[PDB]
């Protein structure tokens, strides 16, 4: 399953600054084209990391599961304020902070 977490591979902390811990923009934040609208992570499988790389991953905290980002971004050239956010979970899904 893909994840909505705010931990998104190889994004600068600039992009996360406007995101809460759950990974959703704050209500009332002003965004611009290319800004990350919401955080999403694409899963990676059959990583087959080398044993020294696996040891490096444990100390560094690098996630084999991530390495790809499916995060939605504000469309190019549209800029406004986030006035409202809604979250719809199915059965067996934990409620996020925003929820």
């Amino acid at each position: 399953p893909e994840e909505i977490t705010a931990d998104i591979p190889n994004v600068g902390e600039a992009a996360l600054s406007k995101l809460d811990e759950s990974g959703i923009v704050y209500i009332g934040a002003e965004v611009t084209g290319g800004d990350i609208l919401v955080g999403k992570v694409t899963p990676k499988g059959e990583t087959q990391l080398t044993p020294e790389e696996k040891l490096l991953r444990a100390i560094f905290g690098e996630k084999a599961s991530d390495v790809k980002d499916s995060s939605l971004r504000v469309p190019n050239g549209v800029s406004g304020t986030v006035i409202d956010v809604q979250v719809f979970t199915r059965d067996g899904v934990e409620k996020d902070k925003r929820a």
Partner: protein
């Protein structure tokens, strides 16, 4: 034209050798490679396969092992039969069907690849030639091993690395002051010993809590991947080898791990380590009558490893006598009796003092000076001795010659380096700024209740709680109470930041929780960008936060959370810091201020301490500034006075109402401070510090490196190299390139590369600000790796090109010939300082005239262009009879150019190797720490160098054919 039985080679993986057509279908052909027995099937179209036929003059070998000489080959029904003279039997007219050729037909010196069909590209030939030139020139650079490390260019560090990294089997004790970079100098010395080839196997023994730190420090700063050996790893390596320590060249392990079993320590002592490094060796207590069971395992190790580096500290204001226990491990025969060392240090102590008076600008009584005169056992001391003291014109140079001679007479300084924070320049000054804020009533009311209810509880815990009001306001105003709304410190912080938006500010607080609350409040009430740096985060995330903080003007304005620190590369661009709180003990206070107070900062430090009126903060500010002078000056008095005052001062913290006796405690603290400072400055072995910091020659080396570090040709060669190999280089823009492999990369795996990519920077300052990037230099493994990959492979060694020039005759022949002069010697000898693989370019004409001295490579290459695969293929064979005659033309001149190069190189070798051997002989006549093994090693190295150089050879590396057309 594939037909069963023909011999073909691969243009790229010729390491497979010859192949044989064994099947054919509509689209594909199959080659068997008898070298391995595998078959590879290729599509006929685009035909990346090579016809194997031979010409008159070639020598070939048959499957029965005999060889022969080909003169003519017939072809019938697609098959070749070679006709010629078998040389071992002298039989003429011998036939050999091509199916019976051996596989050991490797990519011969390119005069054979002319008839291989499609030839390689011309930009890979360009990369090949440029690569050999740059690698050759860089191997001989004087300061190799001193630019690729991810450190600031601090003179004393580079000096220590230069001195120690070039010794043979170095055995030294690093007793640098705490916080100066002991592990940094250690890593630099390791980088030198590994890069120079002097060492291949290394063992570092570290306490477990620091093992990961070493793993990251050596990996991120020095590009060295160490293998950590724990019990699990030890077992999995026991399975893979008789000796587990044979599977990896570089090994980290714990000293507690080292002592587990005896068979373990013996396997370790037999693993044939070239170097052993043990940090914090002062934890090894040793008595001559009773050595501890801990010291005994290292004493067993340091005898089985030639070079051994011990990193240690020298605390509690004691002398190097405490160090004897470890010096005994370096040279057990030279240092074998405590008392003699005691006599030496006591009788030199007055001499050291008198020297300190000399260089301090004092006069030295005759009674004093005839004790140094006793030390330097000569007779012409007097004339040079007096000019230095009378302040004549050359009193400076006479002082410098005296100190130079003094260092050679120091009893330990060749084997002991002690840099002090007083003997090293470059540190920024530190100015303090205090701000008195009114303690808000919400805190007074919340704490007085705990005060009343706190009837029976020790003052120690009253002061530990009352230190941080935020976390007692969470018991009476409820947990998570919004204290970040009335606390005046927050308003002061915001006001200062919003009034100084163009300044990066380092803000230190006690606990990570308060740091998260601070980020939230600065954001939701002033929009201040602040990254948190706490212990709970992973290494990559904290690195990400440092990255954000490093953005010149678009990133985080603020930072920071709890102690953690430990970030080797520092915030050299940040010069203003605010202490949102103050720590309890002075060691954490001075280390926190240390994180920034480093050599290489932008400007002086401004320290701002906003503290609440009438609380423990108000006490501690007064204690630290007026009493210890710990903010504006760095003298390490804090711990002693802190221990001598602890129990008294606690009462002054837990109850700031009792004011009498405080101001006298402060004067007592300042008195102790002055006494400790005086005793320490009068205990300074300023000679040892001058020998340690390297002086003016070391600062000159450091600035030569600071100027070599602006090499733009490096970046321009790098881009070409990678792009040719097929590595996508996305330019993020802020001096950071992101390298990612590509679908068209040229090698199965790149050793360092991963599909997710790596970020690099060529600027040392960006690297010091962005530890997530690889600091690329000529000595960086990525470049050395690609270099070995290209110069070992055969791509870029052969191509053809046409030239359209009206100012030349039609059909003229120019031949670019790149010979390579090489020596065969073990890398341990470090022959590459004097003769790396060296290119010899020659631009021959139809008459064998060399133009290379007149015709530079680039200018000639610019106006040249390549051909198409097919026409060019046999266009090469159009001059097969000519080029063969062109080669011998240069054959007679290459030996002249070679003998010039060899003679000059052997000359440079004998001068420097005799000058260093002479210096070492002078030292043995002047210093007792030089071992016989050392001098024997240098003599044998000189002899072996002259011998291996006397047998150096040449070889044809590259060959480009040029034919002028006007079509």
């Amino acid at each position: 034209p594939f037909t069963l039985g023909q011999r073909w080679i691969s243009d790229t993986e010729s390491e497979l050798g010859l192949g044989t057509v064994v099947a054919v279908d509509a689209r594909t052909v199959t080659l068997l490679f008898p070298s391995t027995g595998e078959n590879r099937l290729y599509a006929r179209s685009d035909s990346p396969v090579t016809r194997v036929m031979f010409n008159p003059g070639d020598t070939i070998t048959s499957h029965d092992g005999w060889q022969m000489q080909v003169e003519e080959v017939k072809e019938e029904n697609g098959l070749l039969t070679y006709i010629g003279t078998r040389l071992d039997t002298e039989e003429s007219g011998v036939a050999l069907r091509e199916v019976f050729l051996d596989s050991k037909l490797v990519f011969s010196k390119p005069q054979d690849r002319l008839f291989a069909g499609q030839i390689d590209r011309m930009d890979r030939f360009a990369l090949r030639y440029r690569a050999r030139k740059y690698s050759s020139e860089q191997f001989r650079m004087p300061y190799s091993g001193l630019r690729g490390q991810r450190t600031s260019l601090i003179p004393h560090q580079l000096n220590i690395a230069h001195d120690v990294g070039r010794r043979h089997a170095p055995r030294v004790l690093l007793a640098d002051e705490v916080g100066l970079g002991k592990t940094i100098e250690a890593g630099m010395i390791l980088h030198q010993q590994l890069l120079s080839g002097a060492a291949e196997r290394v063992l570092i023994i570290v306490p477990e809590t620091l093992q990961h730190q070493w793993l990251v420090e050596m990996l991120r700063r020095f590009n060295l991947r160490f293998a950590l050996f724990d019990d699990e790893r030890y077992a999995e390596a026991q399975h893979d080898a008789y000796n587990p320590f044979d599977t990896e060249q570089l090994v980290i392990c714990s000293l507690d791990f080292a002592r587990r079993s005896k068979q373990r320590l013996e396997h370790l002592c037999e693993a044939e380590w070239d170097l052993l490094v043990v940090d914090e060796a002062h934890h090894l207590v040793w008595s001559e009558d009773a050595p501890s069971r801990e010291y005994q395992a290292i004493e067993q190790l340091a005898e089985h490893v030639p070079g051994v580096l011990l990193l240690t500290a020298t605390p509690e204001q004691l002398g190097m006598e405490s160090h004897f226990a470890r010096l005994r491990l370096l040279d057990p025969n030279r240092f074998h009796d405590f008392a003699q060392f005691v006599e030496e240090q006591k009788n030199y102590r007055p001499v050291a003092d008198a020297v300190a008076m000399l260089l301090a600008g004092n006069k030295l009584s005759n009674d004093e000076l005839n004790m140094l005169g006793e030390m330097i056992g000569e007779q012409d001391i007097e004339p040079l001795l007096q000019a230095a003291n009378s302040d004549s014109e050359d009193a400076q140079s006479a002082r410098q010659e005296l100190v130079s001679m003094l260092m050679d007479r120091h009893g330990t300084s060749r084997v002991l380096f002690r840099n002090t924070r007083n003997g090293v320049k470059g540190f920024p000054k530190r100015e303090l700024h205090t701000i008195k804020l009114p303690l808000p009533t919400q805190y007074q009311t919340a704490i007085k209740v705990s005060g009343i209810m706190g009837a029976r509880k020790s003052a120690e815990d009253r002061a530990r709680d009352m230190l941080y009001p935020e976390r007692i306001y969470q018991e009476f105003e409820g947990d998570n109470a919004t204290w970040w709304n009335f606390d005046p410190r927050v308003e002061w912080l915001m006001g200062y930041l919003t009034s100084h938006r163009s300044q990066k500010v380092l803000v230190i607080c006690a606990k990570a929780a308060t740091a998260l609350q601070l980020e939230q409040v600065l954001r939701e009430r002033e929009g201040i960008r602040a990254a948190v740096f706490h212990e709970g985060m992973s290494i990559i995330e904290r690195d990400r936060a440092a990255a954000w903080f490093a953005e010149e003007d678009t990133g985080a304005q603020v930072l920071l959370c709890s102690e953690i620190g430990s970030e080797g590369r520092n915030f050299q661009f940040a010069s203003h810091m605010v202490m949102f709180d103050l720590p309890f003990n002075p060691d954490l206070l001075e280390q926190r201020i240390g994180r920034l107070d480093r050599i290489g900062q932008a400007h002086d430090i401004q320290i701002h301490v906003p503290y609440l009126e009438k609380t423990a903060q108000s006490v501690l500010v007064r204690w630290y500034h007026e009493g210890l002078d710990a903010f504006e000056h760095t003298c390490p008095t804090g711990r002693t006075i802190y221990d001598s005052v602890y129990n008294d001062l606690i009462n002054y913290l837990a109850s700031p109402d009792q004011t009498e006796g405080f101001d006298d405690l402060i004067k007592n603290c300042r008195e102790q401070h002055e006494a400790l400072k005086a005793q320490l400055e009068q205990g300074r072995d300023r000679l040892l510090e001058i020998h340690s910091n390297g002086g003016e020659k070391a600062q000159a080396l450091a600035e030569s490196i600071e100027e070599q570090d602006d090499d733009t040709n490096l970046i321009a060669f790098a881009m070409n190299l990678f792009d040719i190999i097929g590595i996508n280089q996305d330019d993020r823009g802020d001096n950071m390139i992101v390298l990612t492999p590509s679908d068209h990369m040229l090698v199965p795996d790149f050793p360092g590369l991963s599909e997710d990519g790596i970020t690099i920077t060529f600027d040392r300052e960006v690297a010091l600000a962005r530890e997530d990037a690889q600091f690329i230099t000529w000595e960086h493994p990525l470049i050395r790796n690609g270099l070995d990959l290209i110069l070992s492979g055969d791509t870029g060694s052969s191509t053809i090109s046409l030239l359209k020039n009206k100012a030349l005759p039609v059909g003229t022949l120019l031949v670019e010939l790149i010979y390579v002069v090489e020596a065969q010697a073990p890398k341990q000898l470090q022959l590459n300082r004097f003769l790396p693989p060296t290119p010899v370019r020659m631009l021959l004409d139809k008459n064998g005239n060399n133009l290379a001295a007149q015709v530079e490579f680039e200018t000639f290459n610019r106006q040249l262009n390549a051909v198409n695969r097919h026409t060019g293929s046999k266009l090469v064979n159009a001059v097969q009879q000519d080029v063969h005659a062109i080669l011998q033309l240069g054959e007679a001149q290459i030996e002249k150019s070679a003998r010039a190069l060899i003679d000059a190189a052997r000359n440079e070798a004998d001068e420097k190797l005799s000058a260093e051997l002479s210096r070492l002989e002078a030292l043995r006549a002047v210093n007792p720490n030089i071992r016989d093994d050392e001098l024997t090693a240098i003599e044998s190295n000189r002899q072996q160098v002259m011998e291996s150089l006397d047998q150096a050879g040449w070889r044809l590396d590259a060959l480009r054919l040029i034919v002028v057309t006007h079509q």
